[PDB]
Amino acid sequence: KKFPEGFLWGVATASYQIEGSPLADGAGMSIWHTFSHTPGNVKNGDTGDVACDHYNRWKEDIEIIEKLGVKAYRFSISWPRILPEGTGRVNQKGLDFYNRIIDTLLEKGITPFVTIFHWDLPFALQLKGGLLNREIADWFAEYSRVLFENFGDRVKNWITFNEPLCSAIPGYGSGTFAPGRQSTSEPWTVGHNILVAHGRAVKVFRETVKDGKIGIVLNGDFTYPWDAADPADKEAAERRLEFFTAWFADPIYLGDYPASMRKQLGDRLPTFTPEERALVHGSNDFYGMNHYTSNYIRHRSSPASADDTVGNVDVLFTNKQGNCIGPETAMPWLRPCAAGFRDFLVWISKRYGYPPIYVTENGAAFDDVVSEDGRVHDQNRIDYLKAYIGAMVTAVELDGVNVKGYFVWSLLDNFEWAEGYSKRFGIVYVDYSTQKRIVKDSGYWYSNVVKNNGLE
């Protein structure tokens, strides 16, 4: 089942999660540094200090990509490595590291997708209020510029924020991601800030790098009614999607926020300055997609609590019939079902006029163990990626969604946030003692896919 001509196959990693060395060669402190280093935040007290040591081992790592022959890499710039005071004096040690990584990538032929922002706000900007200050739009833009003027020439394909929802709700609503606040307003304000920040981010992209792609990356798990016969659930399943992901895409593609979110969030949800709307409307060149899983959604009798950020629905694993979304993975929430991946890709398409789409993250986590043969036999993770690269073809072929590339989360096992090291998403195993790298079975498996350009 061969794919379109030039379909990009990639792997994605992200600064904080693999680099290690959060402070070296002039780097500032990140909000993730702060948070992981506080009691209570992260599974076994894990932090991002060492991690994958990728900081020391990027040559080896890019090489692990080369052998695998994977046409593209998505990776972050760490903000406090480029601007430790967040603003003003730019660190050259920072650039040194990245411009290297890039140059290498291009030398060996791998395509670079850079994420301008993957969750590490400079503690410096956090002290000032962080992603809550309206001033983030200035900051963010300021930063983007430094990156465009240093990397623009060599890096064609840009992603502004990664998964803003996560930034917003886990970070100011439920308090489980950094900075860990728990408002019932702040998520919405922060969401809004990111979109104008995205806006200012992109206007300057369009002024400085008039030859490249740029977009936001949004996660979102597809939904299924809990009782299909009940129109309440079929509405709920769609409403949920709106709160999950239309929250950022409707402004981007359509001008405003979802009517459902407005109906419910009232004045907690900012209005757009027309000067704002001009920045945000049609401001991504492609739709960047992160996708993992799906749920059955049941409606709710009671009205919504102020605390709510989901759209007053029950998020489930079993529907009325007693059927179940799919089986277990290491991640207790993430159950596989590739129907949901197809379905989601269609949902987007119909809703945003068939944009070009990069699936900038797909992946699964199981409890991998190195076998006595030294190989890492992760059958279940092959199985996963089969089903989903499966569904993605169907979407492309039949429903005619214009997918354009697909990255695996992740090349390496990493620091998986509040969850620490306890969870492996790698196509490549990493024993954190020796920082040895064993290409997991599914790494060679994805190799075949890439090479053959489709599923055998």
Tab-separated table of C-alpha atoms in Angstrom:
chain	number	residue	atom	x	y	z
A	1	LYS	CA	0.000	0.000	0.000
A	2	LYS	CA	2.424	2.695	-1.275
A	3	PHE	CA	1.910	6.369	-0.127
A	4	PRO	CA	1.830	9.643	-2.096
A	5	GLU	CA	5.039	10.776	-3.819
A	6	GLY	CA	7.355	12.407	-1.247
A	7	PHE	CA	5.270	11.635	1.845
A	8	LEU	CA	7.610	12.569	4.766
A	9	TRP	CA	8.404	9.937	7.318
A	10	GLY	CA	9.837	11.242	10.525
A	11	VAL	CA	10.483	10.716	14.196
A	12	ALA	CA	9.916	13.362	16.888
A	13	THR	CA	11.701	14.108	20.077
A	14	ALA	CA	11.512	17.263	22.238
A	15	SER	CA	14.090	19.371	24.128
A	16	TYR	CA	13.434	18.833	27.814
A	17	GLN	CA	12.546	15.180	27.484
A	18	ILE	CA	15.810	13.837	26.033
A	19	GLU	CA	18.533	16.511	26.055
A	20	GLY	CA	19.655	16.333	29.727
A	21	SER	CA	22.007	19.131	30.902
A	22	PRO	CA	19.320	21.845	31.334
A	23	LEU	CA	21.851	24.414	32.642
A	24	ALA	CA	25.114	23.939	30.718
A	25	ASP	CA	26.943	26.443	28.449
A	26	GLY	CA	24.883	29.424	29.623
A	27	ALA	CA	21.345	27.957	29.637
A	28	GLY	CA	18.666	29.585	31.859
A	29	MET	CA	16.256	27.670	34.098
A	30	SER	CA	13.046	26.396	32.511
A	31	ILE	CA	9.679	26.024	34.121
A	32	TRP	CA	10.154	22.332	33.700
A	33	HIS	CA	13.443	22.430	35.528
A	34	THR	CA	11.695	24.094	38.383
A	35	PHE	CA	8.725	21.744	38.527
A	36	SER	CA	10.377	18.379	38.232
A	37	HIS	CA	12.839	19.483	40.875
A	38	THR	CA	9.965	20.092	43.320
A	39	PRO	CA	8.502	17.379	45.608
A	40	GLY	CA	5.243	15.891	44.375
A	41	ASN	CA	5.332	16.512	40.719
A	42	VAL	CA	6.783	13.632	38.834
A	43	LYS	CA	6.391	9.826	39.310
A	44	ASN	CA	9.479	8.769	41.186
A	45	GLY	CA	10.991	12.166	41.675
A	46	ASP	CA	12.469	11.936	38.167
A	47	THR	CA	13.726	15.188	36.626
A	48	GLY	CA	15.029	16.204	33.195
A	49	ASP	CA	18.644	16.672	34.349
A	50	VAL	CA	20.244	13.676	32.654
A	51	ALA	CA	17.405	12.035	30.653
A	52	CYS	CA	18.780	10.832	27.316
A	53	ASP	CA	21.934	12.946	27.562
A	54	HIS	CA	21.129	13.746	23.972
A	55	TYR	CA	23.039	16.985	24.575
A	56	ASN	CA	26.223	14.944	24.560
A	57	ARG	CA	24.948	12.280	22.166
A	58	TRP	CA	23.241	13.987	19.280
A	59	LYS	CA	25.835	12.820	16.774
A	60	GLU	CA	25.224	9.203	17.804
A	61	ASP	CA	21.457	9.847	17.762
A	62	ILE	CA	21.174	11.472	14.350
A	63	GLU	CA	23.250	8.450	13.244
A	64	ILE	CA	20.691	6.048	14.741
A	65	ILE	CA	18.217	7.928	12.494
A	66	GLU	CA	20.549	7.687	9.431
A	67	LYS	CA	20.952	3.883	9.597
A	68	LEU	CA	17.178	3.606	9.995
A	69	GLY	CA	17.065	5.887	6.905
A	70	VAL	CA	14.139	7.953	8.168
A	71	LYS	CA	13.573	10.920	5.854
A	72	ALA	CA	12.835	13.518	8.696
A	73	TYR	CA	13.473	14.722	12.286
A	74	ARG	CA	11.195	16.898	14.457
A	75	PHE	CA	12.900	18.418	17.480
A	76	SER	CA	12.669	21.505	19.754
A	77	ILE	CA	14.797	24.493	20.483
A	78	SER	CA	15.032	24.926	24.285
A	79	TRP	CA	14.092	28.532	24.965
A	80	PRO	CA	16.294	29.151	27.989
A	81	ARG	CA	19.264	27.752	26.025
A	82	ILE	CA	18.746	30.456	23.416
A	83	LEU	CA	17.718	33.331	25.696
A	84	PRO	CA	18.417	32.546	29.363
A	85	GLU	CA	17.090	35.854	30.642
A	86	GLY	CA	14.220	34.860	28.287
A	87	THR	CA	14.755	38.146	26.533
A	88	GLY	CA	17.607	40.344	25.306
A	89	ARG	CA	21.112	38.821	25.425
A	90	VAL	CA	21.158	35.782	23.073
A	91	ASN	CA	23.430	32.857	24.070
A	92	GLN	CA	25.881	31.710	21.390
A	93	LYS	CA	26.594	28.393	23.137
A	94	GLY	CA	22.869	27.744	22.544
A	95	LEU	CA	22.892	28.402	18.785
A	96	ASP	CA	26.263	26.576	18.556
A	97	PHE	CA	24.527	23.339	19.639
A	98	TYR	CA	21.539	23.683	17.343
A	99	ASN	CA	23.104	25.103	14.166
A	100	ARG	CA	25.404	22.036	14.534
A	101	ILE	CA	22.488	19.559	14.882
A	102	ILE	CA	20.850	21.182	11.805
A	103	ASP	CA	24.018	21.264	9.662
A	104	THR	CA	24.481	17.549	10.438
A	105	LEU	CA	20.858	16.759	9.614
A	106	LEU	CA	21.182	18.434	6.222
A	107	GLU	CA	24.631	16.887	5.578
A	108	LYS	CA	23.299	13.317	5.973
A	109	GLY	CA	20.009	14.240	4.233
A	110	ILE	CA	17.452	14.139	7.079
A	111	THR	CA	14.730	16.891	7.009
A	112	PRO	CA	14.426	19.117	10.093
A	113	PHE	CA	11.079	20.170	11.632
A	114	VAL	CA	11.825	22.590	14.504
A	115	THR	CA	9.373	23.191	17.328
A	116	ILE	CA	9.843	26.771	18.434
A	117	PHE	CA	8.067	25.863	21.753
A	118	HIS	CA	7.766	22.548	23.601
A	119	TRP	CA	6.771	23.410	27.169
A	120	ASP	CA	10.001	24.884	28.615
A	121	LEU	CA	9.163	28.516	29.427
A	122	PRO	CA	12.310	30.282	30.734
A	123	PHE	CA	11.869	30.631	34.489
A	124	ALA	CA	12.844	34.227	33.690
A	125	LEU	CA	9.562	34.817	31.771
A	126	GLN	CA	7.638	32.774	34.404
A	127	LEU	CA	8.627	35.158	37.157
A	128	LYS	CA	7.030	37.904	35.001
A	129	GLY	CA	3.711	35.940	34.989
A	130	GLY	CA	4.746	33.582	32.190
A	131	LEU	CA	2.235	32.438	29.582
A	132	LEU	CA	-0.360	34.286	31.609
A	133	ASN	CA	1.020	37.794	30.835
A	134	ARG	CA	-0.429	39.351	27.691
A	135	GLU	CA	3.252	40.185	27.096
A	136	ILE	CA	3.943	36.581	25.986
A	137	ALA	CA	2.961	37.709	22.481
A	138	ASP	CA	5.900	40.126	22.458
A	139	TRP	CA	8.300	37.674	24.118
A	140	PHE	CA	7.305	34.809	21.845
A	141	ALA	CA	7.649	36.855	18.687
A	142	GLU	CA	11.011	38.182	19.939
A	143	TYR	CA	12.247	34.635	20.371
A	144	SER	CA	10.887	33.371	17.062
A	145	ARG	CA	12.839	36.121	15.335
A	146	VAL	CA	16.184	35.028	16.869
A	147	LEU	CA	15.407	31.523	15.533
A	148	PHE	CA	14.264	32.639	12.093
A	149	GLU	CA	17.300	34.906	11.599
A	150	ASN	CA	19.712	32.175	12.734
A	151	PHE	CA	17.995	29.083	11.350
A	152	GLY	CA	15.535	30.320	8.697
A	153	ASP	CA	18.051	29.642	5.907
A	154	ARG	CA	18.582	25.945	6.781
A	155	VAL	CA	15.201	24.957	8.308
A	156	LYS	CA	12.177	25.000	5.962
A	157	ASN	CA	9.490	23.514	8.283
A	158	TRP	CA	8.372	25.178	11.506
A	159	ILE	CA	5.975	24.428	14.317
A	160	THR	CA	5.153	27.220	16.825
A	161	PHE	CA	3.641	25.860	20.043
A	162	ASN	CA	3.260	22.160	20.680
A	163	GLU	CA	-0.036	20.996	22.193
A	164	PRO	CA	-1.280	24.218	23.710
A	165	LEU	CA	-4.225	22.532	25.394
A	166	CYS	CA	-1.669	20.818	27.612
A	167	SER	CA	0.033	24.161	28.501
A	168	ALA	CA	-3.340	25.565	29.341
A	169	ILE	CA	-5.462	23.081	31.270
A	170	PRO	CA	-2.877	20.802	32.820
A	171	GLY	CA	-0.773	23.907	33.535
A	172	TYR	CA	-3.342	26.447	34.919
A	173	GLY	CA	-6.536	24.458	35.326
A	174	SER	CA	-5.750	21.125	37.048
A	175	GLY	CA	-2.161	21.924	38.060
A	176	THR	CA	-0.445	18.722	36.931
A	177	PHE	CA	1.910	20.268	34.364
A	178	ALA	CA	4.120	23.272	34.947
A	179	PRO	CA	3.646	25.964	36.464
A	180	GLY	CA	0.866	23.991	38.227
A	181	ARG	CA	-1.814	26.595	38.837
A	182	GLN	CA	-5.468	25.776	39.303
A	183	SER	CA	-7.668	28.609	38.101
A	184	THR	CA	-11.046	28.239	36.459
A	185	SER	CA	-10.286	31.296	34.342
A	186	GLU	CA	-6.539	31.115	33.599
A	187	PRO	CA	-6.721	28.212	31.088
A	188	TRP	CA	-8.877	30.302	28.748
A	189	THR	CA	-6.805	33.398	29.100
A	190	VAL	CA	-3.668	31.350	28.480
A	191	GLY	CA	-5.159	29.647	25.465
A	192	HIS	CA	-6.015	33.046	24.031
A	193	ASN	CA	-2.500	34.339	24.742
A	194	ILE	CA	-0.956	31.414	22.855
A	195	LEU	CA	-3.017	32.026	19.744
A	196	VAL	CA	-2.062	35.732	19.558
A	197	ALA	CA	1.462	34.603	20.445
A	198	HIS	CA	1.093	32.190	17.546
A	199	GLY	CA	-0.135	35.036	15.394
A	200	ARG	CA	2.758	37.354	16.182
A	201	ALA	CA	5.036	34.300	15.816
A	202	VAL	CA	3.810	33.698	12.287
A	203	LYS	CA	3.549	37.266	10.958
A	204	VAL	CA	7.288	37.573	11.436
A	205	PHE	CA	7.861	34.118	9.888
A	206	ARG	CA	6.104	35.528	6.809
A	207	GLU	CA	8.262	38.687	6.928
A	208	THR	CA	11.578	36.870	7.408
A	209	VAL	CA	11.466	33.390	5.875
A	210	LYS	CA	9.300	33.822	2.721
A	211	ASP	CA	10.088	30.233	1.597
A	212	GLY	CA	8.896	27.921	4.390
A	213	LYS	CA	5.986	26.157	6.096
A	214	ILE	CA	4.716	26.945	9.629
A	215	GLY	CA	1.757	25.828	11.817
A	216	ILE	CA	0.457	24.920	15.296
A	217	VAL	CA	0.408	21.362	16.552
A	218	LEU	CA	-2.756	20.230	18.298
A	219	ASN	CA	-3.566	16.979	20.054
A	220	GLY	CA	-7.004	15.475	20.299
A	221	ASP	CA	-8.504	12.069	20.691
A	222	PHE	CA	-11.540	11.166	18.573
A	223	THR	CA	-14.868	10.391	20.234
A	224	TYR	CA	-17.716	7.862	19.873
A	225	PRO	CA	-21.143	8.114	21.373
A	226	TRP	CA	-21.673	6.048	24.522
A	227	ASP	CA	-25.117	5.205	23.278
A	228	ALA	CA	-25.271	5.743	19.532
A	229	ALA	CA	-29.072	5.674	19.581
A	230	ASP	CA	-29.148	8.733	21.853
A	231	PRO	CA	-28.660	12.073	20.082
A	232	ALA	CA	-27.467	13.577	23.366
A	233	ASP	CA	-24.351	11.418	23.200
A	234	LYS	CA	-23.802	12.100	19.470
A	235	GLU	CA	-23.922	15.785	20.300
A	236	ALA	CA	-21.670	15.269	23.350
A	237	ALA	CA	-19.119	13.410	21.305
A	238	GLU	CA	-18.966	16.291	18.892
A	239	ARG	CA	-18.979	18.959	21.566
A	240	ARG	CA	-16.082	17.294	23.269
A	241	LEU	CA	-14.089	17.471	20.079
A	242	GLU	CA	-14.813	21.202	19.961
A	243	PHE	CA	-13.585	21.781	23.487
A	244	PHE	CA	-10.586	19.496	22.891
A	245	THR	CA	-9.269	20.839	19.627
A	246	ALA	CA	-11.662	23.237	17.806
A	247	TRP	CA	-10.785	25.563	20.645
A	248	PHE	CA	-7.554	26.338	18.820
A	249	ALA	CA	-8.404	25.505	15.195
A	250	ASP	CA	-11.668	27.411	14.800
A	251	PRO	CA	-9.988	30.636	15.603
A	252	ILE	CA	-7.120	29.644	13.326
A	253	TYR	CA	-9.187	28.489	10.327
A	254	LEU	CA	-12.507	30.171	10.929
A	255	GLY	CA	-11.947	33.420	12.830
A	256	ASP	CA	-13.558	32.628	16.213
A	257	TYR	CA	-14.029	30.119	19.052
A	258	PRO	CA	-16.665	27.394	18.989
A	259	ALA	CA	-20.242	28.529	19.657
A	260	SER	CA	-20.508	25.633	22.190
A	261	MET	CA	-17.595	26.883	24.181
A	262	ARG	CA	-18.919	30.414	24.102
A	263	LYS	CA	-22.364	29.150	25.132
A	264	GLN	CA	-20.762	27.488	28.164
A	265	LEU	CA	-17.661	29.546	29.061
A	266	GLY	CA	-19.347	32.911	28.725
A	267	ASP	CA	-17.040	35.794	29.572
A	268	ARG	CA	-14.355	33.454	30.886
A	269	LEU	CA	-13.459	33.122	27.204
A	270	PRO	CA	-11.811	36.257	25.754
A	271	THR	CA	-13.150	38.058	22.653
A	272	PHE	CA	-10.951	38.885	19.645
A	273	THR	CA	-9.600	42.354	19.054
A	274	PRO	CA	-10.050	42.747	15.310
A	275	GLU	CA	-6.308	43.499	15.306
A	276	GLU	CA	-5.884	40.075	17.015
A	277	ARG	CA	-8.164	38.263	14.566
A	278	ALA	CA	-5.946	39.556	11.774
A	279	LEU	CA	-2.969	37.717	13.222
A	280	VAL	CA	-4.704	34.476	14.118
A	281	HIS	CA	-7.026	33.960	11.137
A	282	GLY	CA	-5.526	31.687	8.536
A	283	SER	CA	-2.229	31.622	10.371
A	284	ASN	CA	-1.125	28.044	9.979
A	285	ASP	CA	0.269	26.826	6.612
A	286	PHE	CA	-0.620	23.234	7.429
A	287	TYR	CA	-2.574	21.533	10.159
A	288	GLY	CA	-0.132	19.876	12.582
A	289	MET	CA	-1.722	16.826	14.216
A	290	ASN	CA	-0.804	14.864	17.329
A	291	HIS	CA	-3.006	11.823	17.736
A	292	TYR	CA	-3.047	8.936	20.175
A	293	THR	CA	-6.338	7.329	21.090
A	294	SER	CA	-10.161	7.616	21.360
A	295	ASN	CA	-13.033	7.386	23.876
A	296	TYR	CA	-16.747	6.837	24.216
A	297	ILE	CA	-18.446	10.027	25.387
A	298	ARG	CA	-21.704	10.070	27.386
A	299	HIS	CA	-23.830	13.198	27.921
A	300	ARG	CA	-24.635	14.715	31.277
A	301	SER	CA	-27.911	15.634	33.056
A	302	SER	CA	-26.506	18.426	35.290
A	303	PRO	CA	-25.240	21.763	33.994
A	304	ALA	CA	-21.468	22.367	33.790
A	305	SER	CA	-19.312	23.293	36.766
A	306	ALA	CA	-17.082	26.348	36.686
A	307	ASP	CA	-14.295	23.848	37.095
A	308	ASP	CA	-15.147	22.063	33.802
A	309	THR	CA	-12.846	22.240	30.708
A	310	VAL	CA	-14.165	19.338	28.683
A	311	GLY	CA	-17.699	20.387	27.711
A	312	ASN	CA	-19.773	18.709	30.388
A	313	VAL	CA	-19.431	15.093	29.134
A	314	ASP	CA	-18.242	11.769	30.710
A	315	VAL	CA	-15.030	10.502	29.118
A	316	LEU	CA	-15.231	6.650	29.048
A	317	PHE	CA	-13.675	3.332	27.892
A	318	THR	CA	-16.826	1.327	27.464
A	319	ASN	CA	-20.068	2.116	25.692
A	320	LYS	CA	-23.599	0.975	26.504
A	321	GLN	CA	-23.145	-2.429	24.826
A	322	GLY	CA	-20.241	-3.226	27.113
A	323	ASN	CA	-17.787	-2.904	24.270
A	324	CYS	CA	-14.459	-1.441	25.121
A	325	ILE	CA	-12.409	1.144	23.307
A	326	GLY	CA	-9.425	-1.113	22.794
A	327	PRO	CA	-6.891	-2.824	24.936
A	328	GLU	CA	-4.365	-1.626	27.592
A	329	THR	CA	-1.066	0.122	26.968
A	330	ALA	CA	1.518	1.295	29.491
A	331	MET	CA	-0.318	4.655	29.553
A	332	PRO	CA	-3.564	3.994	31.466
A	333	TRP	CA	-5.531	6.538	29.443
A	334	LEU	CA	-4.128	5.783	25.970
A	335	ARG	CA	-5.971	2.729	24.444
A	336	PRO	CA	-5.382	1.945	20.803
A	337	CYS	CA	-8.026	2.203	18.083
A	338	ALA	CA	-7.080	3.288	14.558
A	339	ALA	CA	-10.661	3.850	13.417
A	340	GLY	CA	-10.375	6.969	15.585
A	341	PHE	CA	-7.262	8.098	13.736
A	342	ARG	CA	-8.947	7.887	10.336
A	343	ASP	CA	-12.103	9.401	11.746
A	344	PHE	CA	-10.143	12.253	13.315
A	345	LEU	CA	-8.301	13.041	10.045
A	346	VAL	CA	-11.602	13.218	8.247
A	347	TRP	CA	-13.187	15.365	10.977
A	348	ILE	CA	-10.445	17.947	10.536
A	349	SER	CA	-10.637	17.914	6.770
A	350	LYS	CA	-14.385	18.440	6.502
A	351	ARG	CA	-14.109	21.168	9.159
A	352	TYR	CA	-11.110	23.167	7.790
A	353	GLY	CA	-11.432	22.800	4.044
A	354	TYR	CA	-9.077	19.912	3.559
A	355	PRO	CA	-5.861	21.446	4.783
A	356	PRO	CA	-2.503	19.781	4.208
A	357	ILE	CA	-1.827	17.766	7.376
A	358	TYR	CA	1.323	16.617	9.140
A	359	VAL	CA	0.738	13.927	11.758
A	360	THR	CA	3.478	15.372	13.971
A	361	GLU	CA	3.104	12.643	16.636
A	362	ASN	CA	1.778	9.113	16.680
A	363	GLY	CA	2.857	6.467	19.099
A	364	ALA	CA	2.400	4.083	21.955
A	365	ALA	CA	3.993	3.107	25.192
A	366	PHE	CA	4.401	-0.368	26.579
A	367	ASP	CA	6.725	-1.841	29.230
A	368	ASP	CA	9.644	-2.859	26.949
A	369	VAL	CA	12.308	-5.265	28.334
A	370	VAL	CA	15.585	-6.103	26.540
A	371	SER	CA	15.470	-9.824	25.609
A	372	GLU	CA	18.426	-12.147	26.274
A	373	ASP	CA	19.327	-11.829	22.555
A	374	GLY	CA	19.833	-8.037	23.151
A	375	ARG	CA	17.005	-7.263	20.703
A	376	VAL	CA	13.880	-5.417	22.008
A	377	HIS	CA	10.842	-7.437	20.939
A	378	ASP	CA	7.962	-4.881	21.104
A	379	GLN	CA	5.300	-6.657	19.036
A	380	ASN	CA	2.462	-4.632	20.462
A	381	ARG	CA	4.095	-1.373	19.409
A	382	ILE	CA	4.475	-2.708	15.830
A	383	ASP	CA	0.841	-3.754	16.023
A	384	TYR	CA	-0.138	-0.266	17.119
A	385	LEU	CA	1.754	1.519	14.316
A	386	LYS	CA	0.451	-0.962	11.763
A	387	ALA	CA	-3.182	-0.157	12.654
A	388	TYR	CA	-2.602	3.619	12.581
A	389	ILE	CA	-0.417	3.899	9.451
A	390	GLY	CA	-3.214	1.626	8.307
A	391	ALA	CA	-6.025	4.000	9.105
A	392	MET	CA	-4.052	6.925	7.730
A	393	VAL	CA	-3.886	5.320	4.239
A	394	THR	CA	-7.651	4.705	4.248
A	395	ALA	CA	-8.132	8.349	5.139
A	396	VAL	CA	-5.876	9.455	2.311
A	397	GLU	CA	-7.104	6.991	-0.282
A	398	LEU	CA	-10.914	7.078	0.187
A	399	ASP	CA	-11.924	10.236	2.110
A	400	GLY	CA	-9.191	12.123	0.407
A	401	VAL	CA	-7.632	13.801	3.406
A	402	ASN	CA	-4.418	15.438	2.332
A	403	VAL	CA	-1.913	13.970	4.843
A	404	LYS	CA	1.631	15.058	3.964
A	405	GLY	CA	4.075	13.507	6.478
A	406	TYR	CA	4.047	11.308	9.605
A	407	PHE	CA	6.338	11.334	12.631
A	408	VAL	CA	6.601	8.714	15.354
A	409	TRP	CA	6.626	9.662	18.976
A	410	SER	CA	9.378	8.890	19.738
A	411	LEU	CA	12.871	8.134	18.366
A	412	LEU	CA	14.230	7.635	21.902
A	413	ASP	CA	12.667	6.740	25.195
A	414	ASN	CA	12.335	10.027	27.053
A	415	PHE	CA	11.251	11.930	30.096
A	416	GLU	CA	7.498	11.577	29.778
A	417	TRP	CA	6.526	14.518	32.075
A	418	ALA	CA	4.605	13.983	35.378
A	419	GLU	CA	5.074	10.336	34.584
A	420	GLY	CA	8.855	10.533	34.525
A	421	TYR	CA	10.843	7.779	32.923
A	422	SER	CA	8.241	5.245	33.872
A	423	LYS	CA	6.837	5.165	30.285
A	424	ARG	CA	8.512	4.259	27.013
A	425	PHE	CA	7.508	5.743	23.659
A	426	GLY	CA	10.744	4.965	21.830
A	427	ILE	CA	11.239	3.230	18.497
A	428	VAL	CA	14.686	2.759	20.198
A	429	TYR	CA	15.282	1.477	23.769
A	430	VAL	CA	17.474	3.392	26.195
A	431	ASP	CA	18.784	1.840	29.421
A	432	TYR	CA	19.324	4.960	31.510
A	433	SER	CA	22.415	3.457	33.312
A	434	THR	CA	24.729	3.037	30.429
A	435	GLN	CA	23.051	5.424	28.042
A	436	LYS	CA	23.019	2.521	25.536
A	437	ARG	CA	20.551	2.565	22.680
A	438	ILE	CA	19.015	-0.649	21.368
A	439	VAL	CA	16.839	-0.155	18.221
A	440	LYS	CA	13.555	-1.630	19.359
A	441	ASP	CA	12.076	-4.179	16.996
A	442	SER	CA	9.506	-1.629	15.874
A	443	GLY	CA	12.419	0.637	14.961
A	444	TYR	CA	13.498	-1.817	12.234
A	445	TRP	CA	9.825	-2.234	11.495
A	446	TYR	CA	9.323	1.427	10.792
A	447	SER	CA	12.511	1.265	8.765
A	448	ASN	CA	10.854	-1.153	6.381
A	449	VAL	CA	7.738	1.083	6.199
A	450	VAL	CA	9.793	4.190	5.413
A	451	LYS	CA	11.902	2.425	2.799
A	452	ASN	CA	9.077	0.603	1.113
A	453	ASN	CA	7.006	3.870	1.554
A	454	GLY	CA	3.985	2.012	2.801
A	455	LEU	CA	2.842	-0.971	4.789
A	456	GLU	CA	3.957	-4.479	3.530
